[PDB]
């Protein structure tokens, strides 16, 4: 039964992965064909940039403002900055904005989402000058609505660009994310690729490569059928008509995912999708953002994301019926991930209970082989030798995401740290108990059996491989070869002041 299970797992994962790669390659090819036909200095589309943040590092906010000012797009109307707060501490970001941009800072005493007149003309009079708004501290979602209203009051603009306060944008990032809007009138939103600049931590590099691979394969396959669900921060585009149509339903929904942060990124895209509007994603637009360096913070963030996804699965599945022939890929990939998680759980339980050395060695060997193939593809696509480090993502995935998923399911099933980390501690204890039970059960040595010799050679080779990879990563830390070239510049500039 173990051989059948591992063979089915391998063939199913390989087939789905190959299909995703083919879809992403086709989407990239058609996007390149579309881009190759555009004329030079194309600035037909007028766009506005909206920045929202709260308790953001002044250095990062200033760098984001500079990156926005470094854009080469020649059809930028205005910049909208909204701060979710009007206190003394919230004025540091306003002062930072005054250093980089004009001193047109407004401090309204009311919130547009909670006012009778939600039009942006109540708090703004001139549309040519850039404006800064210090709204009362309500939440991330309220900040975005004010920016939408400020952008909507000017009929000259045709689209908006949504970025985070810590996002670093390239010179051509704005043009690339807004170009495909005019290519197809059915396109109302475009997603932008996000990269992690800081790679000075073991977890940071793993999550950076995971995000890069995710953007390449899942978002690429979704963009091939034009049914992307993750569009918005930290780099994305939206047409004015769709946001004007769906601003009220987005803000009238009940929000309980997080406190005073974590705006509803996926819900806006789901609202767009339920109206039958195609949404594409482009990899040419590159954005830079930081990633958590603490394992506990990463675990809780992934748990929150898992709870949000488990809440919005019903909506994202119901939104696929309008697409007709297309849209079944959403249910297909949801079932793929669900069955993958269930199969991982079942395989782990089976190997823990039966404690068969022959099957465990084959399972770890095939898992290592498929992970090495994925890392090799990542290296080939990114043209970087550091993509082979993705092989260590399996450990952090197994030790962080699975307990996070169990916690997310338990919370919504039918003491602050008890509901956050106790489940993870119990999972770790169970894993350790299963491992010790397995090793004590098969505690013997017999060099006269080829199967035992094969299992020992396989496990020794796996241990040697992981040890040498860890040694190489450790050597890269002192050599600073693993450091992102953009990260080094930021470190030097921070050292300067």
């Amino acid at each position, epitope marked *: 039964s173990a051989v059948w299970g591992i063979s089915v797992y391998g063939v199913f994962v390989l087939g789905f992965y190959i299909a995703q790669i083919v879809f992403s390659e086709f989407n990239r090819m058609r996007l390149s064909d579309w881009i190759s036909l555009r004329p030079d200095n194309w600035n037909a589309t007028r766009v506005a940039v909206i920045i929202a943040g709260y308790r953001e590092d002044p250095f990062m906010f200033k760098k984001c403002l500079e990156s926005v000012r470094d854009s080469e797009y020649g059809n930028v109307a205005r910049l909208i900055c909204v701060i979710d707060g009007d206190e003394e501490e919230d004025l540091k970001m306003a002062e930072i904005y005054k250093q980089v941009y004009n001193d047109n800072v407004k401090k309204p005493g009311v919130v547009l989402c909670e006012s009778e007149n939600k039009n942006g003309s109540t708090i703004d009079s001139d549309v040519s000058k850039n404006i800064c708004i210090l709204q009362p501290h309500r939440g991330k979602r309220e900040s975005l609505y004010t920016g939408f209203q400020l952008a909507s009051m000017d009929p000259s603009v045709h689209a908006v660009v949504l970025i985070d306060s810590d996002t670093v944008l390239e010179k051509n990032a704005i043009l690339e994310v807004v170009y495909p809007l005019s290519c197809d009138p059915n396109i109302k939103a475009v997603a932008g690729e996000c990269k992690i600049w800081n790679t000075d931590t073991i977890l940071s590099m793993l999550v950076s490569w995971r995000y890069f691979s995710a953007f390449n394969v899942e978002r690429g396959a979704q963009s091939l059928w034009k049914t992307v669900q993750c569009v918005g921060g930290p780099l994305g585009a939206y047409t004015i008509d769709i946001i004007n149509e769906i601003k009220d339903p987005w803000i009238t929904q009940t929000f309980l995912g997080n406190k005073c942060t974590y705006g509803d990124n996926r819900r806006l895209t789901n609202e767009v999708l339920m109206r039958g509007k195609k949404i594409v994603y482009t990899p040419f637009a590159v954005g830079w953002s930081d990633s958590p360096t603490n394992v506990m913070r990463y675990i809780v963030q992934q748990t929150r994301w898992s709870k949000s996804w488990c809440r919005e699965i019903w909506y994202t599945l119901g939104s696929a019926w309008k697409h007709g022939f297309s849209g079944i890929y959403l249910a297909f990939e949801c079932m793929y991930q669900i069955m993958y998680f269930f199969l991982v759980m079942y395989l782990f339980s089976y190997i823990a209970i039966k404690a068969d050395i*022959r099957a465990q060695t084959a399972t770890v060997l095939v898992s290592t082989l498929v992970t090495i193939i994925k890392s090799s593809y990542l290296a080939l696509r990114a043209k970087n030798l550091k993509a082979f480090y993705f092989v260590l993502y399996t450990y952090v995935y197994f030790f962080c995401m699975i307990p996070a998923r169990i916690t997310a399911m338990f919370t919504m099933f039918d003491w602050l740290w008890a509901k956050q980390f106790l489940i993870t501690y119990m999972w770790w204890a169970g894993v350790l108990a299963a491992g010790v039970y397995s090793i004590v*059960d098969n505690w*013997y*040595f*017999d*060099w*006269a*059996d080829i199967q035992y010799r094969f299992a020992l050679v396989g496990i020794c080779s796996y241990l040697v491989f992981v040890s040498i990879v860890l040694v190489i990563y450790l050597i890269g830390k002192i050599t600073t070869w693993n450091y992102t070239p953009l990260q080094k510049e930021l470190i030097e500039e921070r050292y300067l002041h």
Partner: nanobody, 123 residues
């Protein structure tokens, strides 16, 4: 530490079949390598058939197509099927157990556990 006991044998003519089984008392019999040895009155013990923990079967000197070895972990016993017996096969059979060992699985000194042995005769 496992104690080996023997139960079986008999007086059967040429071409008969016998079923010999060995019972072991211990803690973890599921991870012990079993082997069978026979001592003729005119020679010394030799390896004829053995089974490892991973159900690997080893035979030599025509035993490949003559005898069959199997083990039952649930009953904590090991048995060696015997078919097409010959008069020259008359010898007392000794079972052996081992937990740690190397490539050598034929010499008597490789196995650190032995049994009292049961007498098997062919007429």
């Amino acid at each position: 530490q496992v104690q080996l006991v023997e139960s079986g044998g008999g007086l059967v003519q040429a071409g008969g079949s016998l079923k010999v089984s060995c019972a072991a008392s211990g803690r973890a019999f599921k991870t012990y390598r079993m082997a069978w040895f026979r001592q003729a009155p005119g020679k010394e013990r030799e390896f004829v058939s053995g089974i490892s923990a991973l159900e690997t079967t080893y035979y030599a000197d025509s035993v490949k197509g003559r005898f069959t070895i199997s083990r039952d972990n649930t009953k904590n016993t090991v048995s060696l099927q015997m078919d097409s017996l010959k008069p020259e096969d008359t010898a007392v059979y000794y079972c052996a157990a081992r937990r740690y060992g190397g490539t050598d699985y034929t010499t008597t000194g490789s196995y650190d556990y032995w049994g009292q042995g049961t007498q098997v005769t062919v007429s």
